[model samples]
Target: GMNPAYRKAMLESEIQKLLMEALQQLRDPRLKKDFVTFSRVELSKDKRYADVYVSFLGTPEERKETVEILNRAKGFFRTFIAKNLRLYVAPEIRFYEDKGIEASVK
Candidate 1:
């Protein structure tokens, strides 16, 4: 069985909303040109890290580039997120390529 507390943090939180908004707010020209979608955002039990799974439809290079763009801006997003969340410290965020969130379930 999964840890109930751990399971709870994985969904139904303001954290998820803020994360999605932050990603959508990005204005990088390279990132803006690509199609991006979220698969899930996994929050650590301690709420100090987040693994953001996103999918992109583009060349491997394009996807890699997109991730690079996001990584560069991760700190900025965290700054913005910190203001909204009002936590003492912002959680670390990393991007992962969600190649097929649906295919795996099938």
Candidate 2:
């Protein structure tokens, strides 16, 4: 048996590397002047879901559009993750902008 914390850490680490590699090959007309950064990955305890936080360098509109592009492109990424990793079930992934959008709003 494995410690849950360690298992979660490894999942996050692996996802970061795979996503980095995937982004290198990803090209889009809307992503002209910028690239996305996967800041962190949040994996559910059950390993059934993954929330990938990403950041981009650009204006608000550009950032918003880029995030949308990636979400729309999840089919490509999801299949990529499924094939590359040895997990019994690939985690469902969702992309979000890595910003303090509501940080101050207690």
Candidate 3:
């Protein structure tokens, strides 16, 4: 019997681990070349949703394109987790383009 809070923390930690591993395993040559980066995984305080903050080292247009690419591949990415992690349920994963850092750099 797992405490509810402990269970939530474990699930969140597992999700973060899977996210990092998936990002590293992403084999897109363009993504690899452009130094695409993902920021910390922010799980909702209620543990319902996960927002993955992503940043890229490239022109604004390129960054936008990268975000689009990630969006398109999100489903596949999620499936990868489903196959890898034997979790009872996978939380809905979402990708959020974090341009604030990039904008500040410019």
Candidate 4:
């Protein structure tokens, strides 16, 4: 019997790693200058969707635009995920801005 909890954790970890690597390979000029990081990834129980939470070091507006670019290039990132992850159905990925704990402290 497969351990669902363990499977989910490993999958999320793998997705996070692969995304950071893929981000480095993106050709978008906007992404070239800014620093980007994956805060975490939420994988659905059915493994059909992945909500990728990310943190950005930029003006609020630039961060908004960055997510837009990242979302727009979903297919490109999906290809990288599909190739690396041994899953029959690769989760459809979506990027979300993670405001993070810094906002609370400030």
Candidate 5:
């Protein structure tokens, strides 16, 4: 048996890699502008849901559009996650823009 905290940390670490890699190859015209940043990832205890907070650097108009595109693009990411992991299920993802709209502590 594994400690749940350690398992959750691994899941988050893995997801961060998957997301960054997927975004690099992602071809979303609307979100094509150096498009986004993975500020923080929130993985649930049950490993059933995630809130992938993004930090964007763009004007109001562009940021809104980018957010919309990312939201729409979540499904594709979910599929990518599903195929790359051996888990029983893919976490439900909800992408949200950071409140400060930016942060980089790593």
Candidate 6:
């Protein structure tokens, strides 16, 4: 049996790996500039879900469009994990447009 805390940490690490790979592999011209910038990743305490926070170096409209692009590609991203990571259970992933941090700076 594994400690839950350890499991959570492992899951976080794995998610980070998956994110990095996805970021590198998801190469679309429209997504090249700002979409490549990942602000942070939040994994649920239970390791059931991951919220990927992103920031775009563009206008708000561009950021919104980039988020939509990521959302549309979510299924492929998940399937990529399932095939590559071989996890017993693939966590549900959600992409979040994280303007809170940027907003605070304004």
Q: Which candidate is the best by TM-score?
A: 4
Q: Taking the tens digit of each residue's C-alpha lDDT, what string does model 6 give over 1-106?
A: 5545746556666666777677788775568644356657767666577777777777887778888888888887788778866668776778777743534321
Q: Against the true structure, candidate 1 has what lDDT?
A: 0.69
Model 3 lDDT per residue over 1-106, tens place: 6545746556666676776677777766467534666665656666556667677778777777887778877876787777876766555577767733434321
Off by over 4 Å in 1: 1-13, 99-106
- Give the per-residue lDDT digits (tens) of candidate 2, residues 23-65: 7767655665345688788777787888888878777787888
Output the better candidate (4/5) by TM-score. Answer: 4
Which ranges of candidate 5 are over 4 A from the true structure?
Answer: 1-5, 33-35, 99-106
Better of 1 and 5 by TM-score: 5
Off by over 4 Å in 6: 1-10, 33-35, 84-86, 99-106
RMSD list, candidates in order = 5.8, 4.7, 6.7, 5.9, 6.2, 6.1
lDDT of 1 by residue, 1-106 (tens): 5555645554535566776677777776567534777556776678687777767778777777788777888887788877986679877876777542544321
Error of 3 at 82 (Å): 3.0
Worst 10 residues of 1 by lDDT: 97-106
Clashes of each: 0, 0, 0, 0, 0, 0
lDDT (CA) per prediction? 0.69, 0.76, 0.67, 0.79, 0.76, 0.71
lDDT of 5 by residue, 1-100 (tens): 5555756766687798898888887778657547468767877677688878777787766666777788888888888998988887798877777643
Worst 10 residues of 6 by lDDT: 97-106
TM-score of each: 0.71, 0.78, 0.63, 0.79, 0.76, 0.69
Candidate 3, pairs of clashing residues = none
